[PDB]
Each structure stands twice: as structure tokens, then as C-alpha cells.
């Protein structure tokens, strides 16, 4: 199973200066629940943003750099390697990966951040005429999660 996993704001911002624009623990907890025990596929810049492989799952980085060899990371070098990997693979970012994979994945786990952030990287446009809402669940606000957000699970129609 091939999934996108992504947080994006009302204008589909995903990124600013190689970090997330928002502070939102609940969504990182969401990511953790989903991807633990499974595989993340991520491009190099995104990996460099996370810095270390995420515990307790397979971390796969897509890069052209054949020097690349990082303890705890699998390297692949073309998009097409993605479809080898076994099990539930989450496409994990960034803009270039989402743009490359969005027409190819079975389904997407999106967190809509109900906010307008300044960004420099974006999730590509998509339509609900294409994507059916398997679930929509409001995140809870609290001291430490103070931006409204909705967990969507969307499945390619038809
Ligand atoms: N909100 C969210 O859910 C998430 C947001 N982000 C954000 O996304 C942004 C990063 O996106 P972006 O800047 O596009 O970078 P990416 O993380 O998508 O990585 C870009 C790099 O990935 C590698 N790559 C991509 N496609 C290929 C390919 N087909 N073959 C070989 N290598 C490939 C290249 O690495 P190289 O040049 O080394 O060869 C390329 O430079 C950041 O701002 C980050 O904060 C990231 C993940 C999640
Ligand atoms: C671009 O930066 C990040 C992207 C991401 C990617 C990411 C974040 N949020 C969502 N919903 N999907 C994603 N694909 C993460 C992330 C990032 O910064 C550390 O942090 C980690 C937390 C510490 C364990 C997890 C994810």
C-alpha cells in the first residue's frame, strides 16, 4: 500500500525554509501512529530537515547523491525503486516527492492546518472530484496545540 502523508495549510503550504511553518505536537503524534512499524519514503532535503532517521520504522531517502550512506537509512536513487519496497509505504515529503507521487498513490493522509502561513514549498493542487473522504476528524485544541486542524484520509476515486 502506497500512501501520501502530509500536513498542509489552507493554501497548501507545506514548508518554510526547510522546516514546518507550524508548531503542532498532535500532528507529529499522528504521523508517529501511522508510520511506526512501516516505511517512510522521503527526499534528501526533507531527510536533512529531520536530520536523523525516525525511530521504529524503515527510513528510505531518495537522492541523486551516490555518496549517500547514512546509518539507519536505506538509499534509493530513482522514483521507480519506490514500488519495490514491501509493506505500507508512506510518501513523506517534500514538495518534489509529493508532486511526483500524487498521481500514483492509492490514498493520502492529509492534515489540513486551518491557517494561512508564509511558505516556500507547497502541496500540489488536487480535487475532491478525484478523492473520496474515507474520514474527516477534527484535531483537538489545547495548551500545546493551538491551531485548528483536520485529519483527512482520502482514497483515489473510481
Ligand atoms: N508539511 C509536511 O507534511 C512536510 C513538509 N516538508 C517540507 O517540504 C520542503 C522540502 O521540499 P523540497 O524542497 O521539494 O525537497 P524534497 O524533500 O522533496 O527533496 C528534494 C530532493 O529529493 C531528491 N529527489 C527528488 N526526486 C528525485 C528523483 N526522482 N531522483 C533522485 N533524487 C530525487 C533530490 O535530492 P538530491 O538533490 O540530493 O539528489 C532533490 O533535490 C521543506 O520545506 C519541508 O519543510 C517535507 C515533508 C513533509
Ligand atoms: C519538514 O520538516 C518536517 C517534516 C515532517 C513530515 C511530516 C509532518 N507532518 C505530516 N503530517 N506529514 C509529514 N510527512 C516531519 C517532521 C519535520 O520536522 C522535524 O518532524 C517529525 C517529528 C519529529 C518527529 C515528523 C515529521
Swiss-Prot record:
Cross-referenced InterPro entries: DHFR, DHFR-like_dom_sf, DHFR_CS, DHFR_dom
GO MF: dihydrofolate reductase activity; NADP binding
Pathway this chain belongs to: Cofactor biosynthesis; tetrahydrofolate biosynthesis; 5,6,7,8-tetrahydrofolate from 7,8-dihydrofolate: step 1/1
SUPFAM superfamilies named in the record: Dihydrofolate reductase-like
Domain of life: Bacteria
Signal sequence region: none
Domain DHFR, first and last residues per copy: 1-156
Keywords assigned: NADP, One-carbon metabolism, Oxidoreductase
Binding locations of substrate: 5-6, 27, 49, 57, 92
PROSITE patterns per the UniProt record, alphabetical: DHFR_1 (PS00075), DHFR_2 (PS51330)
Pfam family membership, one: DHFR_1
Transmembrane segments: none
Binding site for NADP(+): 6-7, 14-19, 43-46, 62-65, 92-97, 100, 121
Cross-referenced CDD domains: DHFR
Class of enzymatic activity (EC top level): oxidoreductase
Catalyses which reaction(s): (6S)-5,6,7,8-tetrahydrofolate + NADP(+) = 7,8-dihydrofolate + NADPH + H(+)
GO biological process, one term: folic acid metabolic process
Entries under PANTHER family matching the protein: DIHYDROFOLATE REDUCTASE
Family according to the record: Belongs to the dihydrofolate reductase family.
Functional description taken from the UniProt entry: Key enzyme in folate metabolism. Catalyzes an essential reaction for de novo glycine and purine synthesis, and for DNA precursor synthesis.
Note: There are two DhfR isozymes in S.aureus, this one is chromosomal and is sensitive to trimethoprim.
Name of protein: Dihydrofolate reductase
Species of origin: Staphylococcus aureus
Taxonomic lineage from the root: Bacteria, Bacillati, Bacillota, Bacilli, Bacillales
